[PDB]
């Protein structure tokens, strides 16, 4: 009833832990050192229980890798059984084009700070 | 005997002008009557100056139509010159897959109310 619920401060995404200029600077450094790679943040959906957390959240993806290959890579790193449902959501939604290079996905879906943000869940929201 | 100045009503989008249940009900009736069409809301970006306003907002798009075809159709109805920048944004972003049927786009990008919302603008 018009009440603002304050979240548990424990859940701090990569974007919430870094300032805008810190993130912009991160992206600039990666562009210089790895010109053919896309910087991708991959995090577990907030309310996810069926899937585990990855050790790492910051990934450098070669420009040529497409979404279906990236999906396969993340499923293997989560050590998922082949029957487990899994969705890799970009700006809240599954990618329709799974055969296009991630560098092409990057140009449509990147954040203002230069990062490509992704969230995985066992449901497509 | 002074003048009563009427204020401008708030500029409300389609989603703000109808309740959730009203929109879910719209979609259900549409699906029942036009089962091979996709219900698409297309509105001009809030802060847009270079493109004009479309006559219509609510569109029924045949399943097989792709985003490239829809862009060409919207650009014609807006009567843009060939050099004007134009972007048709789905959930805030341009589609990478401009050759796939919109019925496939629908399944990944639709709203929880069953509509597919698009915004057009002269920039991304």
């Amino acid at each position: 009833e018009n009440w603002e619920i304050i979240g548990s401060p424990s859940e701090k995404t990569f974007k919430q832990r870094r300032t805008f200029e810190q993130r912009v600077e991160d992206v600039r450094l990666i562009r210089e050192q790895h010109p053919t790679k896309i910087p991708v943040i991959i995090e577990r959906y907030k309310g996810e229980k069926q899937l585990p957390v990855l050790d790492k959240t910051k990934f450098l993806v070669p420009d040529h890798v497409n979404m279906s290959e990236l999906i396969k890579i993340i499923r293997r790193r989560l050590q998922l059984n082949a029957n487990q449902a899994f969705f890799l959501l970009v700006n809240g939604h599954s990618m329709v084009s799974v055969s296009t290079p991630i560098s092409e996905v990057y140009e449509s879906e990147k954040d203002e700070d230069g990062f490509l943000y992704m969230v995985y869940a066992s449901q497509e929201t």
Side-chain angles (χ1 to χ4, degrees), chain A residues 2-9 13-45 47-54 56-125:
Chain A
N2 208 347
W3 278 89
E4 188 63 36
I5 291 89
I6 293 321
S8 187
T13 70
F14 164 97
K15 188 177 205 186
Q16 295 166 336
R17 299 183 298 128
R18 286 159 161 94
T19 73
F20 185 75
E21 296 301 333
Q22 276 170 352
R23 288 178 272 116
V24 162
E25 170 62 14
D26 289 347
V27 168
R28 172 184 86 77
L29 291 165
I30 278 142
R31 284 174 180 160
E32 302 201 324
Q33 298 176 11
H34 309 278
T36 67
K37 293 182 170 43
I38 296 306
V40 188
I41 306 296
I42 299 171
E43 292 166 308
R44 185 179 72 170
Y45 189 75
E48 178 60 42
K49 310 164 185 61
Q50 292 199 357
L51 307 174
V53 314
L54 297 161
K56 311 274 180 278
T57 62
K58 301 157 60 182
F59 297 80
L60 292 183
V61 189
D63 286 352
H64 75 269
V65 175
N66 62 44
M67 286 300 299
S68 94
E69 292 168 326
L70 177 60
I71 285 166
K72 282 190 50 151
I73 289 166
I74 304 305
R75 285 183 63 102
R76 189 180 63 244
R77 281 168 173 261
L78 295 168
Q79 296 194 80
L80 300 198
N81 182 268
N83 303 323
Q84 165 68 47
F86 169 94
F87 302 93
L88 187 52
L89 304 174
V90 184
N91 294 310
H93 299 273
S94 287
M95 294 294 296
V96 170
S97 174
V98 302
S99 49
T100 45
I102 193 172
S103 55
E104 196 188 339
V105 170
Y106 176 78
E107 294 300 346
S108 292
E109 305 282 347
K110 64 184 178 194
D111 190 275
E112 272 179 319
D113 63 8
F115 281 113
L116 180 54
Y117 288 91
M118 296 183 180
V119 165
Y120 61 85
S122 51
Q123 303 148 334
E124 216 172 359
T125 284

